[PDB]
């Protein structure tokens, strides 16, 4: 419903999740949303500004949205296209709020059960088998974090 999405949008603009700003792409189209994501201050994402998109079906909330990062992200659970499978964002237990909360969660601790990016996953593990001594997985996050300044000059804050 347009009502469900109108209610969800308004509810997320009235009580934001800290580090997430949600807007409509075209204010005349409730089915496509843009999400701004500000990296949490004590992770390797801190200072980063990431951009992602949400697409909802015409039968929402019966059917879940699609999530995809616009920013390229090196991550076990993110595809090169930017896609994250919705089931890892909306796990077995309002919808978009919980989705946003999984994003913080997934950014902080990857899920190596069955990874989208195996190279990222093999690297993330190296980062664990050594107590942070192999900085490579951590290095790419940093590079990606500071590359996002360019995006956040193109618009800002």
UniProtKB/Swiss-Prot annotation:
<dbReference type="GO" id="GO:0004842">
    <property type="term" value="F:ubiquitin-protein transferase activity"/>
</dbReference>
<keyword id="KW-0547">Nucleotide-binding</keyword>
<comment type="subunit">
    <text>Interacts with multiple Cul1-RING E3 ubiquitin-protein ligase complexes, also known as SCF (SKP1-CUL1-F-box protein) complexes. Identified in a SCF E3 ubiquitin ligase complex together with HINT1 and RBX1. When cullin is neddylated, the interaction between the E2 and the SCF complex is strengthened. Interacts with multiple Cul2-RING (CRL2) E3 ubiquitin-protein ligase complexes, also known as ECS (Elongin BC-CUL2/5-SOCS-box protein) complexes. When phosphorylated, interacts with beta-TrCP (BTRC).</text>
</comment>
<comment type="pathway">
    <text>Protein modification; protein ubiquitination.</text>
</comment>
<protein>
    <recommendedName>
        <fullName>Ubiquitin-conjugating enzyme E2 R1</fullName>
        <ecNumber>2.3.2.23</ecNumber>
        <ecNumber>2.3.2.24</ecNumber>
    </recommendedName>
</protein>
<dbReference type="GO" id="GO:0043161">
    <property type="term" value="P:proteasome-mediated ubiquitin-dependent protein catabolic process"/>
</dbReference>
<keyword id="KW-0067">ATP-binding</keyword>
<keyword id="KW-0808">Transferase</keyword>
<keyword id="KW-0131">Cell cycle</keyword>
<dbReference type="GO" id="GO:0016567">
    <property type="term" value="P:protein ubiquitination"/>
</dbReference>
<dbReference type="GO" id="GO:0005524">
    <property type="term" value="F:ATP binding"/>
</dbReference>
<dbReference type="GO" id="GO:0006511">
    <property type="term" value="P:ubiquitin-dependent protein catabolic process"/>
</dbReference>
<dbReference type="GO" id="GO:0005829">
    <property type="term" value="C:cytosol"/>
</dbReference>
<dbReference type="GO" id="GO:0005634">
    <property type="term" value="C:nucleus"/>
</dbReference>
<dbReference type="GO" id="GO:0000209">
    <property type="term" value="P:protein polyubiquitination"/>
</dbReference>
<dbReference type="GO" id="GO:0005654">
    <property type="term" value="C:nucleoplasm"/>
</dbReference>
<dbReference type="GO" id="GO:0035458">
    <property type="term" value="P:cellular response to interferon-beta"/>
</dbReference>
<comment type="similarity">
    <text>Belongs to the ubiquitin-conjugating enzyme family.</text>
</comment>
<dbReference type="GO" id="GO:0036211">
    <property type="term" value="P:protein modification process"/>
</dbReference>
<dbReference type="GO" id="GO:0006270">
    <property type="term" value="P:DNA replication initiation"/>
</dbReference>
<dbReference type="GO" id="GO:0016607">
    <property type="term" value="C:nuclear speck"/>
</dbReference>
<dbReference type="GO" id="GO:0000082">
    <property type="term" value="P:G1/S transition of mitotic cell cycle"/>
</dbReference>
<comment type="function">
    <text>E2 ubiquitin-conjugating enzyme that accepts ubiquitin from an E1 ubiquitin-activating protein, and catalyzes its covalent attachment to other proteins by an E3 ubiquitin-protein ligase complex. In vitro catalyzes 'Lys-48'-linked polyubiquitination. Cooperates with the E2 UBCH5C and the SCF(FBXW11) E3 ligase complex for the polyubiquitination of NFKBIA leading to its subsequent proteasomal degradation. Performs ubiquitin chain elongation building ubiquitin chains from the UBE2D3-primed NFKBIA-linked ubiquitin.</text>
</comment>
<keyword id="KW-0597">Phosphoprotein</keyword>
<dbReference type="GO" id="GO:0061631">
    <property type="term" value="F:ubiquitin conjugating enzyme activity"/>
</dbReference>
<keyword id="KW-0833">Ubl conjugation pathway</keyword>
<dbReference type="GO" id="GO:0070936">
    <property type="term" value="P:protein K48-linked ubiquitination"/>
</dbReference>
<keyword id="KW-0963">Cytoplasm</keyword>
<feature type="active site" description="Glycyl thioester intermediate">
    <location>
        <position position="85"/>
    </location>
</feature>
<keyword id="KW-0832">Ubl conjugation</keyword>
<keyword id="KW-0539">Nucleus</keyword>
<feature type="domain" description="UBC core">
    <location>
        <begin position="1"/>
        <end position="150"/>
    </location>
</feature>
């Amino acid at each position: 419903s347009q009502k469900a999405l109108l209610l969800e949008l308004k509810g997320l603009q009235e009580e934001p999740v800290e580090g997430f700003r949600v807007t409509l792409v075209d204010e005349g189209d409730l089915y496509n949303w843009e999400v701004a994501i500000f990296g949490p201050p004590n992770t390797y994402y801190e200072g980063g500004y990431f951009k992602a998109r949400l697409k909802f079906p015409i039968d929402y909330p019966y059917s879940p949205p699609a999530f995809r990062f616009l920013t390229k992200m090196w991550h076990p659970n993110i595809y090169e296209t930017g896609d994250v499978c919705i089931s890892i964002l909306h796990p077995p237990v309002q919808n978009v709020r919980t989705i946003l909360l999984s994003v913080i969660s997934l950014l902080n601790e990857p899920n190596t059960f069955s990874p989208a990016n195996v190279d990222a996953s093999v690297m993330y593990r190296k980062w664990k088998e050594s107590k942070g001594k192999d900085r490579e997985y951590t290095d790419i996050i940093r590079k990606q974090v500071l590359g996002t300044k360019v995006d956040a000059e193109r618009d800002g804050v």
